[PDB]
Design a protein around this ligand. Sequence first.
Ligand SMILES: [Mg+2]
Ligand SMILES: [Mg+2]
Ligand SMILES: [Mg+2]
Ligand SMILES: [Mg+2]
Ligand SMILES: [Mg+2]
Ligand SMILES: [Mg+2]
Ligand SMILES: [Mg+2]
Ligand SMILES: [Mg+2]
Ligand SMILES: [Mg+2]
Ligand SMILES: [Mg+2]
Ligand SMILES: [Mg+2]
Ligand SMILES: [Mg+2]
Lengths: 87, 217, 144, 185
Amino acid sequence: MENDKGQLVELYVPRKCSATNRIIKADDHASVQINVAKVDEEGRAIPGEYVTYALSGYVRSRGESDDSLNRLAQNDGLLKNVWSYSR
Amino acid sequence: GWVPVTKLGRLVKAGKITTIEEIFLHSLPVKEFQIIDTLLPGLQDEVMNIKPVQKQTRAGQRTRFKAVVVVGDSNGHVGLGIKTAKEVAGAIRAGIIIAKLSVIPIRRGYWGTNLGQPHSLATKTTGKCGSVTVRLIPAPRGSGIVASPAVKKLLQLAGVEDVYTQSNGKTRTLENTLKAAFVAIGNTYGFLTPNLWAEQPLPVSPLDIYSDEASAQ
Amino acid sequence: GKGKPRGLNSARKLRVHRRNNRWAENNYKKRLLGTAFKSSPFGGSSHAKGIVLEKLGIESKQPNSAIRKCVRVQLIKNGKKVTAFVPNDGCLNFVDENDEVLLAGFGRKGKAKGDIPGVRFKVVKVSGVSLLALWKEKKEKPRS
Amino acid sequence: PRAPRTYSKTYSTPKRPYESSRLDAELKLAGEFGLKNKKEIYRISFQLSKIRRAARDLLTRDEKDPKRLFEGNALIRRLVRVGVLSEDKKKLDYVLALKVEDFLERRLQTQVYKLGLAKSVHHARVLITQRHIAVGKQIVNIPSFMVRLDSEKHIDFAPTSPFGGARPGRVARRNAARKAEASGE
RNA sequence: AUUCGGGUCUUGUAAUUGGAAUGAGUACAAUGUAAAUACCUUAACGAGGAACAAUUGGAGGGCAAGUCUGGUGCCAGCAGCCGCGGUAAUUCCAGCUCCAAUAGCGUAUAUUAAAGUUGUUGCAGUUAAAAAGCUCGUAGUUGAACUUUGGGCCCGGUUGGCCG
RNA sequence: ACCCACUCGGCACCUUACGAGAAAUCAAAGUCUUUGGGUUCUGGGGGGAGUAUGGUCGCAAGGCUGAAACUUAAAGGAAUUG
Ligand SMILES: [Mg+2]
Ligand SMILES: [Mg+2]
Ligand SMILES: [Mg+2]
Ligand SMILES: [Mg+2]
Ligand SMILES: [Mg+2]
Ligand SMILES: [Mg+2]
Ligand SMILES: [Mg+2]
Ligand SMILES: [Mg+2]
Ligand SMILES: [Mg+2]
Ligand SMILES: [Mg+2]
Ligand SMILES: [Mg+2]
Ligand SMILES: [Mg+2]
């Protein structure tokens, strides 16, 4: 969000949910962020590098949080043969 | 003085969180009003209403006080709180504590064109509470705040300049009115407008960059 | 479908329905039935002269007992009897009988549990003098 | 059978009558500028409002449309001649942002006190209605003259007036006659 | 400021003072005007203004404004609505004060807004007013999908840039 | 006949709410100020009153259609404490 001088003028660009592309808002205490650990060849996880996801409180309440996480991870290289695109 | 009891409080008192914008971005649940105090220094309260309430406790009749209190920056932050205590100044005190706690951002934007600072709202919003609905509509600049006294105060203390309202229901119950209005401004940051489509990279929580800090002894 | 026809060639049904439905409004019914010209004591005018028929000591009980110092007035244009309040006057030394009296409207709702009724008129003038001016000792009353 | 002489109201009474905030705002506004009715304020609020309407009605139409161009530019340059709108704000979106004081600051009343021909604002009132204060070759005796910008640099005392020049007033030569006759005696 | 005093400013006053200003009104003249009246002009007068004296409604709430004195309380909780007591009343009556709009302000009737309490935009219908006992059925309102898409060429306009 | 899996169509129940609602509650009473899928009917404070009058249907008892003057500050819903 800009004005004419080309400068941004918001309080903050907010976090969007990853499953649902909807906005997570500030009072949503059911929303969540998931850090998954990047791993070495030696099977050690580095202390400070994460693949992170966002989830709206809506999706966790509705009980789709899991399946959503699955698909997301699987597509982002974490898993394989857990989540099918067909059912 | 003040001793934090929450791993969000020790983060604050150790100046590891500058603005609230970092609380709000990650939705980190506030429970220590002092947080809001330090992060929002220029927060100006306002008792909207004070009401004698008749308690009947085990055949012992007492008189207490219900207080509806609003707080806010005249930039982008509001807060609303209701509290009942045994003494008036006590009620007001506690009320301000509560409203401090439930402080919310606001997306204020433009009407049509795009000059100077954002003056009005970004989109039409609507809050409902009780039987009351309150609807807020973008005005053009200099249209002032078109609302009844209560809702007008709540919006002024939230740095809105120009906004048309439309209410409905028994607006005479000021607590439902205020609550509803509150909801309606508290929805602005929740309406996905096209200028927010661009994908961001997920930020890493203050709670994890400063995790060694503000950890319980 | 919100129970009303919403079709593009449906106007007639809509507006007709509206006409049949406006008869539940109160004022509309008063206004197309000419209730004002047929029944209302004033005949649809903001005022009426009348002549005081009888000085009334009505007594209206609950919740507050008015020693109702009111009047029976008969309107000149209708020959229609009416009751009317005569304000601000403790003794009623101002209004006697056979006196010409200009009346206006007055909105006192009557109450049930004490049998207090609702007069609808207040004396504005007596014998051509304003009730107020008399009461202010500003003007005096020609007594005939 | 004439033509019917057209005419119009000028102001508009507020919607909520007792509103402790508006009450005060109004009073301080009357105070800065020495007005006598709230009505004087209302008159301004009303002209303002008609301008804000013309403004919006132009704003909702397309840029580079003949009408918005024409009436836009007109409204703008009109607002500028009286120096209500500043030289740099020459675009519609500011004429909306305009407020009351921006109008209240161009009164002859005001400009007399801000060109320092008066000691206080009230003094400026009196001095105006007293037929003292001219704008160029004209006297003007209305506190609401609304000074155009090219007429700012002309306001002075009246060539008729005691201060402007001429002979002393009636009181002055009264006391001149009193002292001269009391000394001749 | 160490203390007297060096001055800036703004106030409360004092039916304190001082000298300025001026049109309300009066009036030669002229202007105006068919003739006049007036306006606009203008000699000559014309206030400390202890009276060139401003009102109309209010002061429990709605709704701006009383934590003020006496009287009441036999002409007394009382009259848009709701409140509220009686030796001691902010709620009645009188004075004082204050508030609002002001050469105007109140009141009555009508009407529009408020009223999303007429609802096309826009109401409601389980229990608050309101789904016909039930189906059939003409006018009426309403009515699935589908029939040149897609591609290639050229022409000249009106805003916007980077050069002027 | 039964048992398991599935499937249209019923029928009630039990959970919840994303949603609605004044609340009780509701798979509709949801997709409703972010207000428009088609259509029928009805209501506009409480009384006066389903009364008076007219018309119509019925052998009658009655039904259908259905006011006004006047009156009144509430009548009413749901929930909560004792
Ligand atoms: Mg309403
Ligand atoms: Mg002549
Ligand atoms: Mg008075
Ligand atoms: Mg009162
Ligand atoms: Mg009041
Ligand atoms: Mg008050
Ligand atoms: Mg309704
Ligand atoms: Mg019932
Ligand atoms: Mg019912
Ligand atoms: Mg049925
Ligand atoms: Mg078709
Ligand atoms: Mg009815």
